[PDB]
Amino acid sequence: AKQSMKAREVKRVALADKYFAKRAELKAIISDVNASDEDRWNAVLKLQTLPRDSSPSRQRNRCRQTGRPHGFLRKFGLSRIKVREAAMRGEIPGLKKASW
Amino acid sequence: VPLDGGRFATSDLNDLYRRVINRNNRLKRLLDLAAPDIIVRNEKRMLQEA
Amino acid sequence: RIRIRLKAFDHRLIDQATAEIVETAKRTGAQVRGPIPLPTRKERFTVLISPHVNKDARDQYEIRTHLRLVDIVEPTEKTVDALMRLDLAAGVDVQISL
Amino acid sequence: KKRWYVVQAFSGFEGRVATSLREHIKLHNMEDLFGEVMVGYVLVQMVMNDASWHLVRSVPRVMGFIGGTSDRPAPISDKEVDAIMNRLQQVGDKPRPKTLFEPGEMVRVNDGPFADFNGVVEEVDYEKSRLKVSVSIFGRATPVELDFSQVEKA
DNA sequence: CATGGGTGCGCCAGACAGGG
DNA sequence: CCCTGTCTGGCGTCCTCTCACCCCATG
């Protein structure tokens, strides 16, 4: 991909663990059946006070070996071209040819 | 080392070190428990003499 | 009652690995509720083998993860004593279920 | 007013020293000069006359008082003597019942072959009174169910 | 089972009081 | 302070050969 692109991911990793999933109660409880006046307006708008690139929906999905955008596999956690050369090298514990 | 019978004939230094360690354990426990002044003075004095 | 759930990849190893804990539990408890089969997941994958176009050429990869159960019946206070810290077969992830 | 004093006995014969002390009191009938006797040190509620001092040191298997001097031996010296006695009693009456553990909480095992081992409680069952914690035995986590008293909270 | 607390030697010599 | 009496410490030959006996005590 790009060394520029792999740097943006770990920067957006640092936002997804510092702000989000910790200051996620801004929408978890306060944007529901609670005080639905314009104090609930302060729930949705203070969510915008945190940066836009901090959401876990923003952290796309990238490979860890080479960082290819597409063709990702969640189990191995790395790109489809990299899972195969490691399969033939004998690195993933158990991948043989599925010839059922 | 033991003798012919089997009872261990123990040296004198083991008595001395075992006394010092018994008293030191007692003094640590009394400073844990916050005993009064005269108790820990006798305890430290027995350790000094040991 | 006291279950022992086995997890591995090498199925030719797990039958001996369970046998290594059979012999460790036979001489202590003398009652073990068998090496139960416990069906295996077949996680199927497929990968575009090309680094580019021609989405016709693919390779299929799978991982048979085998499971077993030992299920020590009685908790006599010497059986588990011969089990904890006294196991083997590096690569076979073991777990109790109780 | 009767103040407290510390007596040293041959350590091990302390109950017999306490009984012989009560009996010497009721022999030499200085009943108005002794209040109690508490149990290698024997605590005595007392007053200080030289007659009662000779009485306590004439009790057998008693070395002497412990104080600043042997002329006028010393009552007691502690900011919280009552709390020190309460701590000594609490040592024998140690509850040690910590077992409460939620998910991801580390616990301690002190019973069964898993004794002397620590782990975390991935699942908890208050209804079944059982904690789901695994022990790092030979590397692999060994998820086992232990009772609250069977394990201690870490 | 494990722990818990005599009274017959004589000289030299220097340090510690003790007058002086 | 300058001499006098006291108080404690430090020490007293080398090799061997047997023997006898090594902490109670007890709730």
Plain-language structure description:
Chain B: It comes from Escherichia coli (strain K12). Chain B: Belongs to the RNA polymerase beta' chain family. Chain B: DNA-dependent RNA polymerase (RNAP) catalyzes the transcription of DNA into RNA using the four ribonucleoside triphosphates as substrates. Chain A is an all-alpha fold. Chain A is built from 4 helices and 1 strand, in the order H-H-H-H-E. Chain A has helices at residues 3-18, 25-28, 41-47, 80-89, and one strand at 96-97. The longest helix of chain A has 16 residues, at 3-18. Chain B has 50 residues and is mainly α. In chain B, helix 1 (12-33) packs antiparallel against helix 2. In chain B, 70% of the residues lie in helices and 0% in strands. Chain B has helices at 12-33, 37-49. Chain D is rod-shaped, with a radius of gyration of 26 Å. Chain D has 3 helices and 9 strands. The chains are: A mainly alpha (100), B mainly alpha (50), C alpha+beta (98), D alpha+beta (154). Strand 1 (96-97) of chain A pairs antiparallel with strand 3 of chain C, so a sheet runs across the interface. The structure holds a DNA duplex (20 and 27 nucleotides).
Give a summary of the structure in a few sentences.
The structure is cut from a larger assembly and holds chains A (100 residues), B (50 residues), C (98 residues) and D (154 residues). By secondary structure, chain A is mainly α.
Q: Kindly state the number of beta strands of chain A.
A: 1
Order of helices and strands of chain C: EHEEE
Based on Cα principal axes, name the global outline of chain C: elongated
Biggest sheet overview of chain A: none
> CA-to-CA gap between the ends of chain A?
35 Å
Give the overall shape of chain A, derived from the CA principal axes: elongated
Total separate domains of chain A? 1
Strand content of chain C: 25-35%
CATH topology of chain C: Alpha-Beta Plaits
Organism (chain A): Escherichia coli (strain K12)
InterPro entries (chain A): Ribosomal_uS14, Ribosomal_uS14_bac/plastid, Ribosomal_uS14_CS
Function (chain A): Binds 16S rRNA, required for the assembly of 30S particles and may also be responsible for determining the conformation of the 16S rRNA at the A site.
GO cellular component, one term (chain A): cytoplasm
